[PDB]
Design a protein around this ligand. Structure first.
Ligand code: GDP
Ligand code: GDP
Ligand code: MG
Ligand code: MG
Lengths: 385, 385
């Protein structure tokens, strides 16, 4: 069964955990599986992703045709970090909005971040409908939500909004539980089949390079995505002028392979290239699938003095190291209009211009370092140049 | 969305129609759609399925992932005609068994006809559970159902049995509607999407043969299934010794193609065989996919006077013309013990022995004719010799 990654996003107290509990419980009694209690999910453990600590609960549940890996976090902070660092990626998100209070600041920001980090589909769940009988009222809250989604480029008009009560569903009210089954139905239908990494174009971040007489140059690394097969044309992108060559062998500790697949640590033989022509930070790519760039717009989270970050703010003029895959690249920071200084612990949008071109695309994550110390983490919101 | 064909089957008054209606109601209520009234489904209209007349109600409904075309018949005789003639196609079936009575004569009859006809999957809806309040009874009936299915080679052990109430579901009881959502779940999961005709092994019933000057022998016909391509090898099966040759062209009214596929009326050029080597009744097939036979066990439905069939019954010693694809082949009938007469409008099982071997396999449909007029319709249940 396909595997989809989703999670609940939304303002605090709007019911993200009761809903997550309700979902696992109702799908378990209906389609089979195991229910998770609210307390267990509420008590989220901490995980250290990219030096940052984040509280994240992971649950799993099944619908007759799919398997879901679901994340739920205690606070807004955990969502900002988790989304920017790419700790728990989502093929789709379930926006939980309380019908009693309507959209709030964190609701708008999670939608904001959702777009920036690249969450492709959002399904809305109008929670707490057991407290609101007023049909016209419920409709207003629905209009607000639809337009908020549209502001941030999500198709609010086609967005599936499901009305329900996560508390009553969990409670065991057969009428409300059906609303969960309705939501699960939308998960299965609205969110399309996600692409497996192996289906994505070949991409290998160059880790190290060696040379063998007659056989040529071997560049090693872990295949990020796709598959490289012996005898096919491959490009060396980033750092310098985009080169091109041909794979002539794939090795794995002496063992010769016909191809190298995603997740595998291999060594690829390149015919027509010398070690000297291979700089640090370059990636082997399927011809014409990735391009080097220098300018890009991003979303960044600056660690707090406590997380091991700076104790002092930085200003427009900060020139840090941007660590991409295998190397640091210095660049210049362009802050948002009206921005003054960026305090440790802040998350903002900044336009970066790298000194040397790096093969990148939307969603590429990076760390902002000062010497050896990680000072931030970011994601390429969109390539500018 | 994938399109699957199913239908309800089981003994009278067990709940096939009430279930068919609850499905359209609950699915419409949950995943969107239109409820169909019980009465309209119950009072099935007549359809003239190839001379034959059957009462069949056709309803449609959707789950989040698929669209279903569902048949429900008013009487046992309609299920028999439907299955034998294949007027109604069933990718899967929902066997409805009342918990108050357990398996009855038509339950077993429908399961057997399901076998004989080639109904691949059977889901069980243990209906009327609002009546039976003792668990012990429920388990006993379930076992009996499973045993019975196993008897006819069905995976009694692995068939999903849903316990519910079609009546309570129809009335709008949330608790019992859940069980229909459960049932919809199994349809989505337990029933595989059917094979496309172009995915099955090539088969082309030869309608005529000519010999093109300087090119060779051409056999005309409509590709029943699969694809034929130039350079591919084919076997001419039926009547005599099986021959093998090579397709060196697939013409189509002067236009020369490189392939012929399921559904097209083409001209297959063969290398080697002379016109005089082809016989009526022979099929062109992918090597080793179909063998010629002479003896088989079948299920037949003798048309009635009003259906344009026989106006007089026949007795043992009847030598009818069996029409297989393109020709009539005489055969000798062997009725069951005690059956010493066959009335029109009657269905009967009969072992047949043909005067000449015809390429066939289980589930093959044929017609019984008398001077070009169809007086019967049957299906090869079990190939014997
Ligand atoms: N009445 C009602 N209370 C709800 C509902 N969903 C959640 N709550 C309550 O609202 C509070 C916050 O819920 P919680 O799941 O912790 O929201 P989160 O902050 O988004 O994770 C708790 O008191 C929940 O039981 C609902 O549908 N109806
Ligand atoms: N108690 C009860 N009666 C039911 C249920 N389902 C069907 N029936 C009744 O059994 C009778 C036959 O139902 P029907 O659907 O017409 O049966 P069919 O011959 O299988 O088509 C009708 O009176 C239904 O109302 C059920 O869940 N519970
Ligand atoms: Mg929570
Ligand atoms: Mg009926």
């Amino acid at each position: 069964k396909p595997h989809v990654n989703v999670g609940t996003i939304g303002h605090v107290d709007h019911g993200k955990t009761t809903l997550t509990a309700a979902i696992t419980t109702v799908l378990a009694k209906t389609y089979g599986g195991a229910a998770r209690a609210f307390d267990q999910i509420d008590n989220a453990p901490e995980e250290k992703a990219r030096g940052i600590t984040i509280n994240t609960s992971h649950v799993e549940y099944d619908t007759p045709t799919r398997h879901y890996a679901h994340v739920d976090c205690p606070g807004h902070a955990d969502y900002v970090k988790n989304m920017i660092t790419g700790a728990a990626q989502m093929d789709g998100a379930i926006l939980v909005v309380a019908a009693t209070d309507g959209p709030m600041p964190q609701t708008r920001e999670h939608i904001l971040l959702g777009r920036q980090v690249g969450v492709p589909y959002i399904i809305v769940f109008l929670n707490k409908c057991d407290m609101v009988d007023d049909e016209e009222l419920l409709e207003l809250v629905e209009m607000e939500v639809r337009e908020l989604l549209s502001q941030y480029d999500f198709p609010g008009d086609d967005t599936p909004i499901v009305r329900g009560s996560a508390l009553k569903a969990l409670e065991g009210d057969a009428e409300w539980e059906a609303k969960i089954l309705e939501l699960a139905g939308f998960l299965d239908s609205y969110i399309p089949e996600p692409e497996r990494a192996i289906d994505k174009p070949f991409l290998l971040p160059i880790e190290d390079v060696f040379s063998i007489s007659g056989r040529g140059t071997v560049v090693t690394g872990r295949v990020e995505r796709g598959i490289i097969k012996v005898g096919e044309e491959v490009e060396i992108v980033g750092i310098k002028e985009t080169q091109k060559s041909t794979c002539t062998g794939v090795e794995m500790f002496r063992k010769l392979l016909d191809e190298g697949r995603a997740g595998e640590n291999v060594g690829v033989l390149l015919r027509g290239i010398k070690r000297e022509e291979i700089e640090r930070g370059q990636v082997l790519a399927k011809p014409g699938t990735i391009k080097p760039h220098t300018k890009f717009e991003s979303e960044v989270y600056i660690l707090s003095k406590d997380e091991g970050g700076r104790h002092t703010p930085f200003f427009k003029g900060y020139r840090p190291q941007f660590y991409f895959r295998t190397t640091d690249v210095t660049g210049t920071i362009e802050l948002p209009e009206g921005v003054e200084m960026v305090m440790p612990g802040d998350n903002i949008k900044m336009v970066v211009t790298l000194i040397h071109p790096i093969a990148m695309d939307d969603g590429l994550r990076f760390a902002i370092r000062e010497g050896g110390r990680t000072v931030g983490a970011g994601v390429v919101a969109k390539v500018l140049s």
